[PDB]
Amino acid sequence: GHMATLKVIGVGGGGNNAVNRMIDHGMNNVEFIAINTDGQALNLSKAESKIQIGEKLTRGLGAGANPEIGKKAAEESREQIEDAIQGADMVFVTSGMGGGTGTGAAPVVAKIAKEMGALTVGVVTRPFSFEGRKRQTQAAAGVEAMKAAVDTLIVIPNDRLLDIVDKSTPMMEAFKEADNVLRQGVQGISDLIAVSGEVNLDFADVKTIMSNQGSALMGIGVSSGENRAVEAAKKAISSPLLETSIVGAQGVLMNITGGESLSLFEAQEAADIVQDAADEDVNMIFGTVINPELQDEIVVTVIATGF
Ligand SMILES: Nc1nc2c(ncn2[C@@H]2O[C@H](COP(=O)(O)OP(=O)(O)O)[C@@H](O)[C@H]2O)c(=O)[nH]1
Numbered sequence: 001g002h003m004a005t006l007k008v009i010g011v012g013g014g015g016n017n018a019v020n021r022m023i024d025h026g027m028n029n030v031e032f033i034a035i036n037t038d039g040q041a042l043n044l045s046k047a048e049s050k051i052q053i054g055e056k057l058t059r060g061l062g063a064g065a066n067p068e069i070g071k072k073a074a075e076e077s078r079e080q081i082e083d084a085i086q087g088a089d090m091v092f093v094t095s096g097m098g099g100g101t102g103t104g105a106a107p108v109v110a111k112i113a114k115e116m117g118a119l120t121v122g123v124v125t126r127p128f129s130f131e132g133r134k135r136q137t138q139a140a141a142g143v144e145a146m147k148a149a150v151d152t153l154i155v156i157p158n159d160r161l162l163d164i165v166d167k168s169t170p171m172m173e174a175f176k177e178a179d180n181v182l183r184q185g186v187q188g189i190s191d192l193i194a195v196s197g198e199v200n201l202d203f204a205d206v207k208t209i210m211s212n213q214g215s216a217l218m219g220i221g222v223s224s225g226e227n228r229a230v231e232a233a234k235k236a237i238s239s240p241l242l243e244t245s246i247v248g249a250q251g252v253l254m255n256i257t258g259g260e261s262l263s264l265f266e267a268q269e270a271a272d273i274v275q276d277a278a279d280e281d282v283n284m285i286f287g288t289v290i291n292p293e294l295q296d297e298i299v300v301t302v303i304a305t306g307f
Pocket residue numbers: 011012013014015017018062063064065095096097098099100101102103125126127128131135158175178
């Protein structure tokens with residue numbers, strides 16, 4: 001019996017908001033850590049574990065869009081960050097690139113996690129184009145730093161949110177759509193680790209697919225009725241919000257969950273959907289869970305790496 005310890009760490013303003021909304025959504029068996037320079041923001045965090053970094057540098061304020069201040073602040077609080085991460089088997093670091101704290105502190109937090117032996121996954125946003133060229137440039141440097149510090153990285157360009165709203169969609173509703181990428185990826189790992197499958201995958205398979213890999217896709221899809229396996233698989237790999245699409249994936253962990261009606265044929269259909277869209281020679285780690293409380297619903301979970 002091995003039950004992996006998962007932690008989700010929000011770094012800076014956008015990252016701490018994401019953690020707050022994940023908490024309100026309710027995600028258990030996961031520990032949440034909030035890291036920030038901005039003490040006023042941190043005081044409103046719902047995370048059980050809060051770390052104010054850089055108080056000597058910023059006097060309790062944010063980094064004023066200076067990534068060097070976010071970096072120095074994280075380095076000066078390294079022991080505090082190590083203590084909060086201690087014991088983790090997997091760490092998700094979420095933050096918005098382009099500002100001062102996230103850009104500079106998130107790669108330091110990720111590096112510490114990886115140096116402590118945790119499987120480290122980053123989920124970061126790129127700023128909207130209307131925030132200007134300098135923000136995008138600073139964000140690009142943060143993304144490169146993240147990629148050098150994580151096992152695997154998921155980038156969400158905020159400009160993609162403009163593809164899924166109408167002219168009236170509330171901004172907070174758009175942000176919740178971006179929140180789902182991290183949240184459902186974490187939930188998929190948790191479900192995979194907690195349930196013994198008929199073809200069982202566990203945390204070691206997660207480690208094999210994600211360790212020292214670079215760009216990643218994490219997706220989930222649910223469908224019912226006719227064509228349910230194909231429709232759920234297409235949903236799992238086709239997010240409009242991703243910088244890294246399924247195309248070019250060389251390693252895929254794929255789990256299918258269904259009721260007693262789960263057919264061998266439709267398991268093949270779903271696997272073929274993922275492999276055709278990859279358009280590559282894919283190493284599938286394939287798994288299957290029979291949940292008898294499910295009736296006509298099928299759930300496909302995909303982790304794709306090796307780009
Ligand atoms: N999708 C999303 N993006 C955010 C959110 N908050 C901030 N951002 C983006 O993240 C970038 C950095 O913001 P922020 O985290 O507040 O800066 P920092 O606290 O100084 O590191 C901004 O330029 C926005 O593009 C959020 O809640 N959701």
